[PDB]
Amino acid sequence: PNHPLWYTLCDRYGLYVVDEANIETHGMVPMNRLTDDPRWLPAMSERVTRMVQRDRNHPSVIIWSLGNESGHGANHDALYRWIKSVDPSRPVQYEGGGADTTATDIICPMYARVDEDQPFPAVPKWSIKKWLSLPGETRPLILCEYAHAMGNSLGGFAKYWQAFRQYPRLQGGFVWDWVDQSLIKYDENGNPWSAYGGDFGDTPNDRQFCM
Amino acid sequence: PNHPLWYTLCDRYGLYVVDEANIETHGMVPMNRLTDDPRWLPAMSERVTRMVQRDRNHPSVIIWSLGNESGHGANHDALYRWIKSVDPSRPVQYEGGGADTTATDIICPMYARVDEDQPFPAVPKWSIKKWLSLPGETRPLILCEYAHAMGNSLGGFAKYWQAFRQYPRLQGGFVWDWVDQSLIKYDENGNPWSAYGGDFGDTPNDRQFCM
Numbered sequence: 001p002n003h004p005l006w007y008t009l010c011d012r013y014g015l016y017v018v019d020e021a022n023i024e025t026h027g028m029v030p031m032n033r034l035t036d037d038p039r040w041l042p043a044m045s046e047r048v049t050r051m052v053q054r055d056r057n058h059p060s061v062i063i064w065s066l067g068n069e070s071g072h073g074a075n076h077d078a079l080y081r082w083i084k085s086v087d088p089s090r091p092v093q094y095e096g097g098g099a100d101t102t103a104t105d106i107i108c109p110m111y112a113r114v115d116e117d118q119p120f121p122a123v124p125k126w127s128i129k130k131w132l133s134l135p136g137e138t139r140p141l142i143l144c145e146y147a148h149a150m151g152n153s154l155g156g157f158a159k160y161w162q163a164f165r166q167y168p169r170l171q172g173g174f175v176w177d178w179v180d181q182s183l184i185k186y187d188e189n190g191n192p193w194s195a196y197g198g199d200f201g202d203t204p205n206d207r208q209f210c211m
Numbered sequence: 212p213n214h215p216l217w218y219t220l221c222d223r224y225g226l227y228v229v230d231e232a233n234i235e236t237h238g239m240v241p242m243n244r245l246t247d248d249p250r251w252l253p254a255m256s257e258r259v260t261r262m263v264q265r266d267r268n269h270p271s272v273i274i275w276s277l278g279n280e281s282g283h284g285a286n287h288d289a290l291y292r293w294i295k296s297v298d299p300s301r302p303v304q305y306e307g308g309g310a311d312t313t314a315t316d317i318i319c320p321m322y323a324r325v326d327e328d329q330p331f332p333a334v335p336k337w338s339i340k341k342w343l344s345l346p347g348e349t350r351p352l353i354l355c356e357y358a359h360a361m362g363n364s365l366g367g368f369a370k371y372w373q374a375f376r377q378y379p380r381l382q383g384g385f386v387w388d389w390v391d392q393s394l395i396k397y398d399e400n401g402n403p404w405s406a407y408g409g410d411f412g413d414t415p416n417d418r419q420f421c422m
């Protein structure tokens with residue numbers, strides 16, 4: 001959840017907002033270790049329910065998200081249902097555990113390609129075109145993350161947009177991401193420069209991957 | 212319906228057969244002029260019912276077809292239902308009226324392309340990959356006719372097969388077609404040569420389009 005002013009500005013200027021609970025357990029092995037554990041349901045529930053209680057009157061918020069990169073655990077299903085019950089006005093989405101779980105109203109993969117399949121075990125990233133028509137699948141598809149804009153990037157961006165326009169059920173995506181997470185440091189002469197991971201003596205670090 | 216021996220041979224040698232009623236009204240304007248007419252329901256019914264009565268015990272027959280290029284009329288819907296009631300063991304397909312009507316269990320277009328839409332009014336031929344995922348669509352897609360093998364042809368054949376293998380619900384198709392419809396004529400020296408439309412003084416005719 002963002003600073004409260006963000007929603008007011010999105011209401012007034014006009015932007016569709018996905019409001020996302022502060023839950024990410026990416027570094028767990030496996031990713032759902034905490035999210036499939038009922039001992040962690042109370043802490044997770046507060047991050048979801050208190051978001052909804054705060055932001056539910058904002059017209060700019062059109063979709064609730066259960067968080068990010070926390071696998072798919074039973075706690076996700078419980079909290080998916082909680083939202084559906086308390087606020088029927090907004091779809092609920094969540095990408096974890098394969099982007100098309102029972103905890104999402106929208107097929108919301110991250111970095112699924114347009115034409116090329118990436119058949120990872122358990123959590124494949126199918127071509128977005130192929131994903132829509134898998135036996136029994138009926139949901140819309142909007143990428144929660146795509147076209148990773150790191151440095152000299154956005155090659156093949158037009159390929160996504162051609163697909164989006166041709167396929168009714170491909171309804172777009174969210175580019176990753178808006179702004180480089182570089183920080184200002186100062187040299188000997190007091191001149192500013194853009195810094196990334198490791199530049200503060202932080203270790204271990206992931207270097208430029210924050211930009 | 213074919214010569215009775217054809218089905219015996221397909222039973223014993225092993226080929227899947229689509230058994231198709233002798234109903235084609237292509238030259239009508241519009242194409243469904245007779246098939247939407249209840250006066251023509253009796254004649255149409257006999258061409259469907261008498262085929263099913265004859266061929267229903269052949270294991271090689273796996274799908275029934277209501278005919279070819281007769282648009283989509285209420286007579287098709289009536290006869291689709293007759294077959295489903297009398298023989299639940301086999302799906303029913305029919306391409307007329309846009310390949311995805313209420314008179315077909317299988318999306319069965321003719322010459323729909325792999326990636327390219329052909330958005331004809333009323334009877335569009337969508338990209339096969341796109342067709343599967345149109346809002347609400349759940350049926351398998353098998354082209355009743357594709358890769359028109361006229362003369363020096365079959366360019367782009369590999370594109371269909373790549374798509375068939377990638378997409379579960381793209382379950383193949385039937386090439387058009389097996390054998391040139393050329394006829395033997397003899398010259399002044401009694402030498403045989405291959406003839407087509409117009410070579411018998413038949414007029415009007417469509418020349419080499421039978422090959």
Ligand code: NA
Pocket residue numbers: 163164165166167168169170171172
């Ligand atoms: Na679209």
Ligand code: NA
Pocket residue numbers: 209210211
């Ligand atoms: Na990053």
Ligand code: NA
Pocket residue numbers: 374375376377378379380381382383
């Ligand atoms: Na297939």
Ligand code: NA
Pocket residue numbers: 420421422
């Ligand atoms: Na022909």
